[PDB]
C-alpha cells in the first residue's frame, strides 16, 4: 500500500526503469518534460520535501501529482487536434512562450507558417506563466493551466487566429513525502530490491480522494460553456484512468457512445455547438520506452447539458433511492445519539 | 487596510464593544457560542496562532466588508431558530427547542426533552464538527459522500429509543485568508493581559490589527457550487425536510456576480425566492445575514435579513448558462482574451 511510482519521470514501483536517460535524470535531478518544453536543463520545481516524485501508485492505480508531468508532446498534439478542428495528419508544431526569445525557434515557425503548418504556442505556470479571463460584474475570473494559441504571424507583430484551453487534474496525498523522498535520496547518492524499495514506499498516507470532482465541476461546467464560441476553439480536461473511475460515480455511471472514430461522447453530440472535451489518459501504456508517453486512452466529447444533468439531476436521483443514503441517513443520526446514552 | 473585526465574539474594529460580557469572554478566552451550545464553558478551539479572531474586516476597493472566519460563530440560537423554521415548515410562533448532540449525555437534558415532546414542543438536535461531530451521507454506486456542517434532527421520541421524523441540513460558508493572523493576535494578546484599559483605538488598535492580509476571494463560489447544487436537489425529498446555506451580505454580493445579477421575486411574507418556487418540489434555502446590524448587543446577533427560497433549475441556469453568456459578450473577456495572449508573447520578444 502507498508507493512512489515515478521518480523524475521514470518508473520505479512495478517496473524499475534504469536506462541511459533514467540514470542521468535521477542524479542531476531533472524533470525532462520541462527540459523538452524549453531547450535548457531545468529541475522539477517542487520543494525538496517532495522532490522528483512526479507520479504515485496506491492500492493498483497510478496517480498524477506533478502538473508538469502532463507536458507530453504526444498528449499535447493529441489533445490539440480535437480542441482545434484538426485531422489526424495535418502538420502540427508546439512552441512554449519563453522559447519565442531565440532566433532559431522564430526562423522555424516563420518557415512553418509559410507552408501551412498549424503552429501552436502554449502558456503554462512555470513556462510562459499562465493566463486568465477578465472579471466582469456578471462573470468571474478564470485561470487556465495550459493556454494553447493558434499562431498565424510573428513578424509584423504576434497575432493569434484562435485559442484553446486545457486543464490538468492533479491529486493530493494527506501526509508528506519527506520520509519516502528522504529514504530514496541516500540510496541514489553513492551505491529494485525488496528491502530498499519497501523503505521508499512505506512513509506516506493514501490519496486525498475527498475532493476529486467537488472542486472541479463548476469551473469545468463553466469553461465547457465558453468552448465553442468567440475565437475560443475548445476546452479540454486531462485526467488519468484512476480519476476517471472516481468521476464515473459523480456522473451516475453513464454509458459513453462510441462514435465511428476513436472517439466517445457523453450524451448526444450530433449537433453540439460547444467544443468540450474530456481526455482520459493512461500513465503506463503497453510500451515501456524512455519516460512513459501519456497516451490518450479515452477521448470524450462532452455535451454540457448532459454533464450538468448527470452530475446534479441524475446522480442525486440515485441518492434518493427508496433504500438509499438519504432514506437511511436518519439511522446514522439515531445511532450517533445512542453514543451519548448513559 | 485589513483589521480583526471581532475578538472572542465581540467587536474590535469599527466600534469597541466594552460591555460586561465583552470584558469577560475575551479575558477568559472563550468562544461564547460553543459555551451556549454546550452547557459547559468552552474556549475558542482555534490554535494559538489564529486565536479568538472570529471575524475579519477588509477594504475591497471601497465601502469595506465584514467576513466570517470561525465557523463556530454561526452558532447563534436566534439564527438557527429562524433558519430551521423554514427548513421544517414551522410557523413563526410554534415552540422550538434546540439541543446540541453532546448534551444528550446529561439526564436533566434528556428529561427536558421528554417534557417538551409531551407538550408538543418541536425538539431539534444538531450535529456540528466541534459539537456532536459531523455527519455524512454514504457514497454509493452512482453517488458520492457528503458531510453537513450542521445536521438538524427533528426528534420524535427519546424514552424508548432515539427516533427522528425528518432532518434538516444547514451549510455555513467561511472566508479564508492568505497569511497568518498570529502577528495581530500576538499584539492584541499582550495588550489584553499586560495593560489595563478598550481605549486603544488609534495607534494601539490599528497596529495590533495590522500585519494582516486580505481575503482569499478566489474560492468564494466555485468551491461551494456543486456542494450546494447537489445538496439542494435533495432538500424536499425522502425525510430530508430542507437544506440551507448561510452566507454574509459580503459573500452574497459576490454570489450575485456569479449568477449574472438576477432579480428576486417578492413573496407575500418576508421571504424572497430565486425563480418561481410556487410548486417547488425541493426545499432549498439561502440565508443572508448582516454581521453588524444597527444594535449594541454585546455579541452581534446573526439576524438573517434575507431568506431566499431557491429554484434549483434557476440556480443552475444562472451559474452555468447565463454567467457564461455574459462572459461571451460582444466585447467581453472571451473576445478580449486573445489580446492578453498576444501582449504576453511580447514579453518574450527578442530585444537589442
Ligand atoms: Fe516533475
Ligand atoms: Fe471563535
Name the B residues in 43-62 with CB < 8 Å from any A CB. Answer: none
Whether the CB-CB separation of A95 and A151 falls below 8 Å is answered with: yes
Contact A312 B229 (CB under 8 A): yes
- Test A337 with B104 for CB contact under 8 angstroms: yes
- Assess B140–A contact: CB distance below 8 Å, yes or no: yes
- A324 touching B (Cβ < 8 Å): yes
Question: Could B332 and A230 be called an inter-chain contact, meaning their C-beta atoms sit closer than 8 Å?
Answer: yes
Does A157 touch chain B if contact means CB atoms closer than 8 Å? yes
Give the residue among B253, B248, B87 at the shortest CA–CA distance from B170.
B87
Question: How far apart, in whole angstroms, are the C-alpha atoms of residue A228 and residue A235?
Answer: 8
DSSP state of B143: B
Binding residue positions of B for Ca(2+) = 134, 149
Q: What is the dihedral of CA A220, A224, A226, A231, to 10 degrees?
A: 120
Report the distance separating Cα B13 and Cα B6, nearest Å. Answer: 7
Query: A260: buried, middle or exposed (CB in 10 Å: 19+, 13-18, 0-12)?
Result: exposed
Question: Ligand 1 centre and the CA of A71: distance in Å?
Answer: 10
Residue A134 and residue B309 in contact, taking contact as beta carbons nearer than 8 Å:
no
Q: Could you tell me the end-to-end alpha-carbon distance of chain B, in angstroms, rounded to an integer?
A: 42
Report helix, strand or coil for B116: helix
How does DSSP classify residue B347?
G
Kindly determine whether residue A230 and residue B140, on different chains, have CB atoms separated by under 8 Å.
no
SS3 (DSSP) at B33: helix
User: Nearest to residue B87, comparing CAs of B309, B312, B303, B316?
Assistant: B309
- At A155, list the grid cell: 513578424
Length of chain A counted residue by residue: 342
DSSP state of A179: H
Experimental method: X-ray
Q: Find out whether A96 and A108 touch, Cβ atoms under 8 Å.
A: no
Question: Count of residues for chain B?
Answer: 352
Across the interface, whether the CB atoms of A140 and B221 are under 8 A apart is answered: yes
> How far apart are the CA of A210 and the centre of ligand 2, in A?
26
CA separation for the pair B3, A196 (Å, rounded): 52
Q: Looking at beta carbons, which residues of chain A come within 8 Å of B162?
A: 333-334, 337-338
Contact A311 B226 (CB under 8 A): yes
Q: Which three cell numbers stand for residue B332?
A: 467581453
The closest alpha carbon to A278, from A326, A227, A330, A332, belongs to A227
The Cα A12–Cα B144 span in angstroms is 33
Task: Give the residue from chain A lying closest to B316, CA to CA.
Answer: A308
Long-range contacts of residues B276-280, Cβ cutoff 8 Å, at least 24 apart: B276/B311, B276/B314, B277/B309, B277/B310, B277/B311, B280/B236, B280/B309, B280/B311
Determine how β-strand A118-124 pairs with β-strand A92-94: parallel
Q: What are the grid coordinates assigned to A138, written together? A: 456578471
Of the ligands numbered here, which is closest to the C-alpha atom of A65?
1
CA dist., res. B74 & res. B57, Å (int): 17
One-character DSSP codes across A285-303: -S---SSPP-EEEEEEEE-
Interface of A with B in 228-287 (CB under 8 A): 229-232, 249-250, 252-253
Q: H-helix or E-strand containing A248?
A: helix A241-250
What DSSP state is assigned to residue A114?
H
CA distances from A18 to A21, A22, A25, A289 (A): 8, 5, 10, 11
- Using the Cβ of A110 and the Cβ atoms of chain B, whether some distance falls under 8 Å is answered with no
Residue of chain B with shortest Cα separation from A219: B222
Residue found by looking up cell 498516507 in the block: A205
Answer for the pair B87, B167: CB distance below 8 angstroms, yes or no. Answer: no
Among B166, B172, B165, residue whose Cα is nearest residue B147: B172
| Residue bearing cell 447563534 | B76
Pairing of strands A92-94, A61-64: unpaired
Q: Is A340–B102 a contact, with Cβ atoms under 8 angstroms apart?
A: yes
Instruction: Give, to the nearest 10 degrees, the angle between helix B225-233 and helix A217-225.
Output: 100
Q: What is the resolution of this structure in A?
A: 2.8
> What is the residue whose three cell numbers read 541514489?
A188
In angstroms, what is the C-alpha Rg of chain A? 22
Strand order of the β-sheet with A118-124 is A92-94, A118-124, A146-153, A159-168, A232-240, A276-282, A295-302, A264-266, A257-258
Q: How buried is residue A240: exposed, middle or buried, by Cβ count under 10 Å (0-12/13-18/19+)? A: buried
CA distance B281 to A175: 43
Nearest to B148 by CA among A243, A329, A50: A329
d(CA A78, CA A261): 14
Which residues of chain A come before a gap where C and the next N are over 2.5 Å apart?
A: 59, 191
Question: A118 near A90, Cβ under 8 Å?
Answer: yes
Residue of B145, B147, B102, B148 lying closest to B125 (CA atoms): B102
Nearest-Cα distance to chain B for A115, in Å, is: 22
| Mode of pairing for the β-strands spanning A132-133 and A142-143 | antiparallel
Amino acid at each position: 500500500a502507498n508507493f512512489i511510482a515515478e521518480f523524475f519521470g521514470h518508473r520505479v514501483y512495478p517496473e524499475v526503469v534504469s536506462t541511459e536517460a533514467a540514470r542521468n535524470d535521477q542524479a542531476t535531478g531533472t524533470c525532462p518534460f520541462l527540459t523538452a518544453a524549453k531547450l535548457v536543463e531545468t529541475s522539477c520545481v517542487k520543494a525538496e520535501t517532495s522532490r522528483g516524485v512526479c507520479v504515485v501508485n496506491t492500492a493498483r492505480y497510478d496517480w498524477l501529482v506533478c502538473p508538469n508531468r502532463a507536458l507530453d508532446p504526444l498528449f499535447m498534439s493529441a489533445a490539440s487536434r480535437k480542441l482545434f478542428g484538426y485531422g489526424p495528419t495535418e502538420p502540427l508544431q508546439f512552441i512554449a512562450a519563453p522559447t519565442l526569445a531565440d532566433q532559431a525557434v522564430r526562423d522555424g515557425i516563420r518557415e512553418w507558417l509559410d507552408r501551412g503548418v498549424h503552429v501552436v504556442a502554449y502558456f503554462q505556470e512555470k513556462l510562459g506563466g499562465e493566463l486568465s479571463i477578465s472579471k466582469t460584474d456578471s462573470s468571474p475570473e478564470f485561470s487556465f493551466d495550459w493556454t494553447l494559441a493558434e499562431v498565424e504571424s510573428i513578424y509584423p507583430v504576434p497575432k493569434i487566429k484562435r485559442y484553446g484551453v486545457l486543464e490538468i487534474q492533479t491529486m493530493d496525498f494527506h501526509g508528506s513525502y519527506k520520509h519516502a523522498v528522504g529514504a530514496i535520496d541516500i540510496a541514489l547518492v553513492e551505491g529494485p530490491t525488496p528491502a530498499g524499495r519497501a523503505a521508499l514506499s512505506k512513509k506516506m498516507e493514501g490519496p486525498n480522494l475527498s475532493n476529486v470532482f467537488k472542486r472541479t465541476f463548476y469551473q469545468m461546467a463553466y469553461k465547457f460553456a465558453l468552448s465553442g464560441h468567440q475565437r475560443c476553439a475548445g476546452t479540454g480536461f486531462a485526467i488519468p484512468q484512476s480519476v476517471w473511475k472516481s468521476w464515473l460515480r459523480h456522473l451516475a455511471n453513464p454509458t459513453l457512445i462510441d462514435n465511428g472514430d476513436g472517439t466517445f461522447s457523453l450524451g448526444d453530440t450530433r449537433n453540439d455547438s460547444e467544443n468540450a472535451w474530456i481526455f482520459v489518459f493512461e500513465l503506463d501504456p503497453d510500451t515501456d520506452a524512455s519516460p512513459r508517453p501519456l497516451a490518450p486512452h479515452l477521448e470524450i466529447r462532452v455535451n454540457v447539458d448532459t454533464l450538468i444533468d448527470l452530475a446534479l439531476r441524475e446522480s442525486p436521483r440515485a441518492a434518493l433511492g427508496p433504500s438509499g443514503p438519504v432514506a437511511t441517513f436518519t439511522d446514522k443520526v439515531e445511532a450517533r445519539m445512542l453514543r451519548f446514552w448513559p
